[PDB]
Symmetry: C3
Subunit: 308 residues, 3 copies
């Protein structure tokens, strides 16, 4: 009865809030929602594997529509030896350290690794974030190349260079057409014992006021599979008005789709594995301001993550 | 290749009809449809489990839209010992004996059992029935507490008290805003040998003409997993105009969404397991009348249930 | 952890193009898309099985909407002995050799085989093709009976007779109501060693200019599960203006929904299994013309199929 497909997944019960209305839910300052994902990992052969993930989001109490299931991921991974790998279809792409974009991606990905230095090249389109709601003609294409070297036993540094074509992006709720963008950046990720010190800087060369950077300190040994593991970190975000932030890997409430004059503030988050494969995560963004000094709304998070 | 997720499901081919048009399908007196559900039961750890169910409904011959898959269930079950259990997310809630509501429920559920007496407390929102099509602000919240005691070896009696906040409910196809409702009720379920005698009574204290009750007799040993098992029962429904019937557990064609002056009539249903995990079910509602004596339309059912 | 359900599926990355715009994508002459399907094969009992398939289509770069998951197949298969089989629900029906229709089908199917001669009878509605977008009342019902005999060790010939009721079909993008149609046809499928020579002819007796036929030659031993297997074939299509072509089993770009005066041209396609359960398929339709001699647009195909 067993085949080549292995079924995994996760469940999440998340709470989001803010001191002002509209940050997470329209005309309100709170949002409680749940997520259920089921992933099918299939072994096509010894060197080829295919991953299909079905995802469903619902809001607690929202019965206007059902929780429609959408194919979040659909891609095939090829292992062309021991150092070369390739992806094609609908997968997850991390542009740089994830500050610019870490979300769904349609296209192809090429990997050339050496266990101490890694080269990744991706060509395709972004799906979520400011790239959401764009047709194929209106969606800018991303030609991304990235370098990642291991500076220590587990610390790593790297950089990237990306090229975005003309397309429509969501700027403060308004889709505007932008010219070509050449986005380059660098990142660092140091991890000594339990201490963590990471940072990332990115900028679009041709667009002014496009600089965005982040930096944070952490301490912990969090692992959702191990009970009792905990983590604490506090990171600072400084992104300008024209900084390309489509779907960031971090949990700040402000990106290109929500801000018209950039974002600048701190965020403290904690993690705790209450049980095995069960983790409690909380976050609190404070001192949120625009690049002109205008105060923004403080935001806070609390979610429960179940892994199976 | 095996993980923590076990895949189950069911399939149904159902036929519904009536002597008048509009009871089941608009502008017609018949409805043939099929249902396919796939459920993923996952063991997060020794004391935590998560259930995700994907459901798809289609009509025989309706090709206007595809059979969109919706996440019917998405919840996590915790076992806090041997007597305390907890649920959270999108699950199934039975308010009382199921006459008032037995369908999808967003919120949290707490269980305290003793193997002879059980206490269940739920807080959240109803999704299907008269609560369908309501946003989070317009969906009334349910604060439900229920008691269930075992009066015999397998017979049981119980009661419940529910509190519904202000919200919009579907009354005869029209969504009207209602004030707070305090719904209380009692039920009995006697099962001696093969004979079954059950009944339920519920009423909203502050709303007049809100009384609803049912009673039925049965005889059989139906079990879909066992071939040759059969069941027959005949039950009578008497629900008034303002009686809260959102999504009843029984198969009467008339509830709050379809009736403007209540429902009152009999219903005879039969069950038969033609094969293992295959069951043939039929039903026939007759003598359907309003609370004022106006005749309603007789309805009849026939479905095939496949379990896997 | 293992149950009665076995999980299979497939993934596809397809490219389609033409010399004229609108053949595959509106206002463009190209279309790159991907497909991911997950099928759940369940054993209800020793003689009953149920199949549920979840399907998701996405376009590379189209982020206007998510890849909604739809239940492509939902049906139950019964084995009433060793020669009689039955299907019910949403399955795949091949009307004749597949030239007229080979796609989703709602209804019931009966099979009576003898390992050398087979009789198949289906009653229901077509879902895809020219039958897409039709409600239950507007969808014509198909009463189909088919005969298939084995003329050689692996060659086979057969025929069919179909009866279509009044209903709406998509004719060149316009849904028109048509009277009853009695469609009959014959087919032949010869397979000697690696050579293949097949053909099919169909016609609606009461509709004029409803004749449609195809013929092709092939050579290969293609099997996606075996690496290195390859196939080549070239087939010719001659279908008239009123010929019923709802969802053909072949890959010609022109059918009843796209053509107003029929289709007539050649098509050469190749297959190659680059890896185990991975296959590369290409096609090229050329010399496309109408039944009046007006030139149509040449089309070409290229897809990658992954099986798991």
């Amino acid at each position: 009865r067993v085949g080549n497909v292995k079924v995994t997944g996760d469940a999440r019960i998340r709470y989001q809030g803010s001191e002002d209305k509209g940050v997470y839910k329209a005309n309100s300052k709170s949002l409680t929602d749940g997520r259920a994902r089921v992933q099918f990992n299939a072994n096509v052969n010894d060197k080829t594997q295919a991953v299909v993930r079905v995802k469903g989001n619902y809001e607690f109490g929202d019965s206007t529509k059902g929780s429609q299931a959408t194919i979040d991921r659909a891609y095939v991974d090829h292992k062309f030896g021991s150092n070369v790998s390739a992806k094609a279809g609908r997968f997850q792409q991390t542009i740089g350290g994830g500050l610019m974009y870490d979300d769904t991606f349609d296209g192809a990905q090429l990997n050339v690794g050496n266990d101490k230095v890694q080269v990744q090249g991706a060509y395709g389109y972004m799906i979520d974030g400011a790239a959401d709601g764009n047709s194929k003609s209106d969606n800018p294409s991303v030609s991304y190349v990235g370098l990642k070297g291991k500076v220590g036993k587990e610390s790593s540094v790297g950089g990237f260079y990306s090229r975005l074509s003309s397309g429509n992006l969501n700027h403060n709720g308004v889709t505007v057409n932008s010219d070509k963008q050449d986005v380059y950046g660098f990142n660092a990720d140091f991890r000594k014992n339990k201490l963590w010190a990471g940072g990332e800087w990115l900028k679009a060369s041709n667009v002014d006021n496009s600089q965005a950077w982040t930096a944070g300190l952490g301490y912990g040994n969090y692992d959702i599979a191990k009970k009792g593991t905990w983590d604490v970190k506090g990171q600072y975000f400084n992104q300008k008005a024209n900084a390309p932030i489509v779907s960031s890997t971090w949990d700040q409430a402000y990106d290109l789709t929500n801000t018209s004059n950039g974002y600048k503030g701190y965020m403290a988050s904690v993690d705790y594995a209450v049980q095995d494969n069960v983790g409690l995560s909380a976050g609190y963004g404070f001192n949120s301001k625009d690049q002109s000094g205008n105060d923004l709304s403080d935001f806070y998070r609390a979610e429960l993550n179940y892994k199976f």
